[PDB]
Amino acid sequence: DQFLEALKLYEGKQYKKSLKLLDAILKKDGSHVDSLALKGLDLYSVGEKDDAASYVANAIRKISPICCHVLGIYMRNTKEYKESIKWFTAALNNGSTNKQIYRDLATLQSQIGDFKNALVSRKKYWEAFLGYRANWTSLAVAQDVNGERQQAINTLSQFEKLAEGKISDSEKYEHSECLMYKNDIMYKAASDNQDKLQNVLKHLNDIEPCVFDKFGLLERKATIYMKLGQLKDASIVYRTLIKRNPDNFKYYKLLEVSLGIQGDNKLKKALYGKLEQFYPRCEPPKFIPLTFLQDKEELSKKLREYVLPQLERGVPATFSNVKPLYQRRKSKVSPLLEKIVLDYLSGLDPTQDPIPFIWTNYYLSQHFLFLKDFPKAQEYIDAALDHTPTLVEFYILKARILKHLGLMDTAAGILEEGRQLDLQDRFINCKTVKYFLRANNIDKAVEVASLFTKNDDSVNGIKDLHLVEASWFIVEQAEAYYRLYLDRKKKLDDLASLKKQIANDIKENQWLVRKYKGLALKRFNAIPKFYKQFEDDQLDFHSYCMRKGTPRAYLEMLEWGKALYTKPMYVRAMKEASKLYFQMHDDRLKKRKETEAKSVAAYPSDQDNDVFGEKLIETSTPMEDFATEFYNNYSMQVREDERDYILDFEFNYRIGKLALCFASLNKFAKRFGTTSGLFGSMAIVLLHATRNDTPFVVTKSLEKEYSENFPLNEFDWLNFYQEKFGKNDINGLLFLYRYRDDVPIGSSNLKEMIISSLSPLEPHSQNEILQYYL
Amino acid sequence: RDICTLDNVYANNLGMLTKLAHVTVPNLYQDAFFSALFAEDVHFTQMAYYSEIPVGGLVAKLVPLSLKGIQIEFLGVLPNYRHKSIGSKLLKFAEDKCSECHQHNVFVYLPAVDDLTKQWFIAHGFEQVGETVNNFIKGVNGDEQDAILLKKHIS
Amino acid sequence: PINIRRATINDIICMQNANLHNLPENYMMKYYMYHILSWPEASFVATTTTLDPTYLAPGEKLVGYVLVKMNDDQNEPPNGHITSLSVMRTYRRMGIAENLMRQALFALREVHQAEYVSLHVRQSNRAALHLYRDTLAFEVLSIEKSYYQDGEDAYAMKKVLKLEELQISNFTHRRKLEDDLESDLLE
Amino acid sequence: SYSMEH
Ligand SMILES: *C(=O)CSCCNC(=O)CCNC(=O)[C@H](O)C(C)(C)COP(=O)(O)OP(=O)(O)OC[C@H]1O[C@@H](n2cnc3c(N)ncnc32)[C@H](O)[C@@H]1OP(=O)(O)O
Ligand SMILES: CC(=O)SCCNC(=O)CCNC(=O)[C@H](O)C(C)(C)COP(=O)(O)OP(=O)(O)OC[C@H]1O[C@@H](n2cnc3c(N)ncnc32)[C@H](O)[C@@H]1OP(=O)(O)O
Ligand SMILES: Nc1nc2c(ncn2[C@@H]2O[C@H](COP(=O)(O)OP(=O)(O)O)[C@@H](OP(=O)(O)OP(=O)(O)O)[C@H]2O)c(=O)[nH]1
């Protein structure tokens, strides 16, 4: 009665009005399970989230169908989808006639990957609402994911038959997408079967005038003909796709196979020249030839014919357009283009031909920057700037050269010069913020970055940057705070040595290291939180893409969701953060400036109390934290061919799981090794771990597999490594060095061997190893 | 369109104008001079583009003996983009504002020693009024110099 | 060189990343999901290519994007909206935006029968204005005072869409032999 | 550029 009044007001968004009533109920029946659960959801909707969880837990400790439904909504709200499924089921089991639960179930089940049960939910909902097309598509999809391709197709075809001439204009798009999806399912089943592929082709032709995804239709068609062996009748299709988008390199490369001229370059150059006439402004016609030709007089006509009219019009990316040719064919191309533009430059007057002059200088600066001729690079770009000081692009290229030379502060300053010319442009601002972070200048970076952020309730844009998921800024800042951490640690161990006002200083240095170690880890932990949201963001789409009618696209979402914790920025943050977590495990085995907190605040006051990240760095279980916050999710999704075996090796070494360490090492040797210095590095570290004093069986596997690779029965390992794996394997050395405690090998003679191996590296790379890894 | 066009200055591209002004006319202009244009005198600003590149600009003032009308305070073009009508377009804009403001006079103070520039103004229908004004320009480095005043009547 | 293709879910993290680098107007990942899973034929991207944060594959990385949707607020005939457009600064002034925009304009009509398209653009943004007003021929529908967060006004722009006008073959030449499709490329 | 402010 009175509880039912309060349930309406939840759907009616009158959350306080609802609570007013529920308090009256619980005043005279504080043990009323129904009221308690609904109170939690009302209090969450506000949301006083700490009271909400307490009211819910109290209700749960006391064990209705409507109560189960309310719990289920709350659990989904708190991302407890597994518990949401328990309570949504309990509503049905305890006599609910609301058939909308089956749709909410299918959503949750799909969300947690349980498609077996999703198929059941899809079916029962479809049986309760055959009227709506979304529920058919929904069902067909669930069958598809459970391998029932033929059952899926049948479901789609049944709706098609029921609505042969019943599709309105507002339904035409959804219809179009469901046709191609049915074609998709058929296509899979056909594999390479000629008869079936002919039927798939048949099907594609009937739907064409009702399918609006022409590009999609045509791409499918071309792949069919190729599978049928009708290569010529596929070439006609690839030529239609090129005419619809003559800037797609992929369509050109496929046509080479379609006409079977892929082999000889004589036939290829004849084609692209003919294409050049049709699409003169497009890239592939003129670029593709360059990849294969060796006939000097023939290609140098074209390279010149390609790169000059770009420099004529003054396109910035000209060099970037040919950087592959450089990268792939350094020997053949780089001493040839050099001359072919340097002599063009020689015929250019700066007053009469300004645009071509300055951009021809821009190319040559990048040219000699690539060849590691740093004075030559600076020379030409200086010439460009002095000529026309109003192009931000010239300051960008210049600042790259100085970063390559290790002059981080100078480089950042050059961008800062360019930034002031154009305060409307965020790209230059970003690149400036990036370079200042690289020179460990965080205050300046934050200041500059804050010029483009909504700072309505913060002193700077840190919060706003977390709100828009700006991983670019957050990963970089994390890494800077890490460098500032290590640098101020060394200055603490140098202050420890000088004991013969220093006590004032070390007290300040001891705050700085805690502050910078904490904020580094704080910032690295913002990334996984983003990607966990990305996973949660799929929730709505389990039902939304069914109504809108985008099943092909929804299936792609699922694959995308299954790869989230393997994407470059998640992996970058993980690996970098491991350095901190690992060392915190190693180390334990062997306020007034709370005013300052305001400027480092990343999350709202309500949610976050630990702003400097003190709890994070002073945890008692660093290895469990790394697993929960980063490693676990990456491990369950990552593919074998992209798996970082060095990381999982180093991970298992600190949780007492050596058997795995062997597996990591073993698998690494199968792809890369077994002559890699890293393979050596890891092996030697694992062997020492087996026996005898070490606090931890694996020896068996060592002698089983790699007896002829190492002198196992056991000496000079550092020498032996220089014999077996070569001295100049820089990375294997570094690996050993960080295990100098648990594996002594003349750590000093290792250190210098590394220092002697640095000579061939670029300035910045030498300095950073010298400063941050040793 | 013409390869050279004009467009407005805003607070975002004010640094463009200062860089143009600092290379073409070193030492004359204070840092705060450009600030006061958008920190908020009735001013008129404009930039000159060649192939969408900032290669010149104008800063002109409205002033209510005479010494009246539109004062040119900056008119600069990068070296290599000179002799392409660009400085003339910037001048014509300043003249056009003079007419739009219902003013009948445009004037400018040049360094008395700078002759190449003096003739370029006179070539555009300017004429000297009076003679060398004693120590009128003050440089950022402290230095000083006599200046000359050119005047052109706009009907 | 720069490649031009359709957008998929696998580009949106890099699309977001380009947006964050190139514009003051930024959206959360869910908004990009909402786009690419609603109009999976409308958006296009520009990447680098290597033959035999923005990194999608080895060698291939996103330098531009055009984020596109249909209007789903009613009740008018079907129309489109250009949500966002960026091209990393180092790859600007090459015709990337034109190619993205032209494809998206043709998509909006061909796929969704959009009879027109709207967008918002800052007054002071010269490059963006040239593209829409000059290169693409958009009419200024209105001025929108204090549209952006920093307080800057916006032009509300619009373009009517007709299928044959928008075909990509029409703009092949800056200033005229075609491919008829019927044989042969051996003549 | 669409603005998502409110
Ligand atoms: C909301 O999203 C709608 S408003 C989009 C504003 N975006 C934005 O400001 C992001 C930063 N800028 C860019 O990403 C980029 O500069 C664009 C997208 C504005 C333009 O990209 P492109 O570099 O690809 O432009 P093109 O297609 O190469 O050029 C098309 C025409 O525009 C002229 N152009 C280019 N840069 C210019 C500058 N800086 N100033 C004036 N005009 C510029 C080109 O000359 C070209 O004109 P044509 O006459 O040659 O066709
Ligand atoms: C204190 C203050 O208010 S600021 C004083 C501002 N100036 C300075 O301090 C110096 C900085 N700027 C300069 O020196 C520039 O050269 C300016 C602004 C004087 C002129 O810029 P330009 O771009 O050369 O102007 P523009 O191209 O219109 O002038 C070219 C001259 O040749 C003519 N001309 C036009 N096109 C051409 C051409 N292609 N070739 C040769 N002459 C040409 C013009 O009529 C003009 O007349 P003149 O030669 O008889 O004097
Ligand atoms: N296309 C391509 N690019 C490659 C390849 N190998 C390395 N690069 C790098 O690409 C970088 C260009 O910068 P971006 O990668 O766009 O930087 P961003 O992610 O921060 O935007 C250069 O490094 P950088 O100088 O560190 O960049 P920055 O610091 O100047 O941004 C260059 O060395 C390759 O095979 N192909």
Side-chain angles (χ1 to χ4, degrees), chain A residues 179 203-214 217-218 221:
Chain A
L179 293 173
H203 178 237
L204 197 71
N205 289 101
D206 293 54
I207 58 175
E208 198 275 350
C210 294
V211 168
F212 301 137
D213 190 355
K214 303 286 103 158
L217 190 140
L218 289 162
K221 198 174 187 185

Coordinates of all heavy atoms in Angstrom, one line a residue, chain A residues 179 203-214 217-218 221:
Chain A
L179 N 19.5 -7.3 -43.0 CA 19.8 -8.1 -44.2 C 21.3 -8.4 -44.3 O 21.6 -9.6 -44.5 CB 19.4 -7.3 -45.5 CG 17.8 -7.1 -45.6 CD1 17.6 -6.2 -46.8 CD2 17.1 -8.4 -45.8
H203 N 22.4 -14.4 -52.6 CA 21.7 -13.6 -51.5 C 22.0 -12.1 -51.5 O 21.2 -11.3 -51.4 CB 22.0 -14.2 -50.2 CG 21.4 -13.5 -49.0 ND1 22.1 -13.0 -48.0 CD2 20.1 -13.1 -48.8 CE1 21.3 -12.3 -47.1 NE2 20.0 -12.4 -47.6
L204 N 23.3 -11.8 -51.8 CA 23.8 -10.4 -51.8 C 23.1 -9.6 -52.9 O 22.9 -8.4 -52.7 CB 25.3 -10.4 -52.0 CG 26.0 -9.1 -51.6 CD1 26.0 -8.8 -50.1 CD2 27.4 -9.0 -52.2
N205 N 22.8 -10.3 -54.0 CA 22.3 -9.6 -55.2 C 20.8 -9.2 -55.0 O 20.3 -8.2 -55.5 CB 22.4 -10.5 -56.4 CG 23.8 -10.5 -56.9 OD1 24.5 -11.5 -56.7 ND2 24.3 -9.5 -57.6
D206 N 20.0 -10.0 -54.3 CA 18.6 -9.8 -54.1 C 18.4 -8.6 -53.1 O 17.4 -7.9 -53.3 CB 17.9 -11.1 -53.5 CG 17.8 -12.2 -54.5 OD1 18.9 -12.6 -55.1 OD2 16.7 -12.7 -54.8
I207 N 19.3 -8.5 -52.1 CA 19.1 -7.5 -51.1 C 19.6 -6.1 -51.5 O 19.1 -5.1 -51.0 CB 19.8 -7.9 -49.8 CG1 21.3 -8.1 -50.0 CG2 19.1 -9.1 -49.2 CD1 22.1 -8.4 -48.7
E208 N 20.4 -6.0 -52.5 CA 21.2 -4.8 -52.9 C 20.3 -3.5 -52.9 O 20.7 -2.5 -52.3 CB 21.9 -4.9 -54.3 CG 23.0 -3.9 -54.6 CD 22.4 -2.6 -55.2 OE1 21.2 -2.5 -55.6 OE2 23.2 -1.7 -55.3
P209 N 19.1 -3.5 -53.5 CA 18.3 -2.3 -53.6 C 17.6 -2.0 -52.2 O 17.0 -0.9 -52.1 CB 17.2 -2.6 -54.6 CG 17.7 -3.9 -55.3 CD 18.4 -4.6 -54.3
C210 N 17.7 -2.8 -51.2 CA 17.2 -2.5 -49.9 C 18.3 -2.4 -48.8 O 18.0 -2.1 -47.7 CB 16.3 -3.7 -49.4 SG 14.8 -3.8 -50.4
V211 N 19.6 -2.5 -49.2 CA 20.7 -2.4 -48.4 C 21.3 -1.0 -48.6 O 21.7 -0.7 -49.8 CB 21.8 -3.4 -48.6 CG1 23.1 -3.1 -47.9 CG2 21.2 -4.8 -48.1
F212 N 21.5 -0.2 -47.6 CA 22.1 1.2 -47.7 C 23.6 1.2 -47.5 O 24.2 2.2 -47.9 CB 21.4 2.2 -46.8 CG 19.9 2.3 -47.0 CD1 19.0 2.3 -46.0 CD2 19.4 2.4 -48.3 CE1 17.6 2.5 -46.2 CE2 18.0 2.5 -48.6 CZ 17.1 2.6 -47.5
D213 N 24.1 0.2 -46.9 CA 25.6 0.1 -46.7 C 26.2 -0.4 -48.0 O 26.7 -1.6 -48.0 CB 25.9 -0.9 -45.5 CG 27.3 -0.9 -45.1 OD1 28.2 -0.2 -45.7 OD2 27.7 -1.5 -44.1
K214 N 26.3 0.4 -49.0 CA 26.8 0.1 -50.3 C 28.3 -0.4 -50.2 O 28.6 -1.4 -50.7 CB 26.8 1.3 -51.3 CG 25.4 1.9 -51.5 CD 24.5 1.1 -52.4 CE 23.4 0.4 -51.5 NZ 22.2 0.0 -52.3
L217 N 28.3 -3.7 -48.7 CA 27.9 -4.7 -49.7 C 29.0 -5.0 -50.8 O 29.2 -6.1 -51.1 CB 26.6 -4.1 -50.4 CG 25.9 -5.1 -51.3 CD1 24.3 -4.9 -51.2 CD2 26.3 -5.0 -52.8
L218 N 29.6 -3.9 -51.2 CA 30.6 -4.1 -52.3 C 31.9 -4.8 -51.8 O 32.4 -5.6 -52.6 CB 30.9 -2.7 -52.9 CG 29.8 -2.2 -53.8 CD1 29.9 -0.7 -54.0 CD2 29.7 -2.9 -55.1
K221 N 31.0 -8.5 -51.6 CA 31.0 -9.0 -53.0 C 32.4 -9.3 -53.6 O 32.6 -10.4 -54.2 CB 30.3 -8.0 -53.9 CG 29.8 -8.5 -55.2 CD 29.1 -7.4 -55.9 CE 28.4 -7.9 -57.2 NZ 27.7 -6.7 -57.9

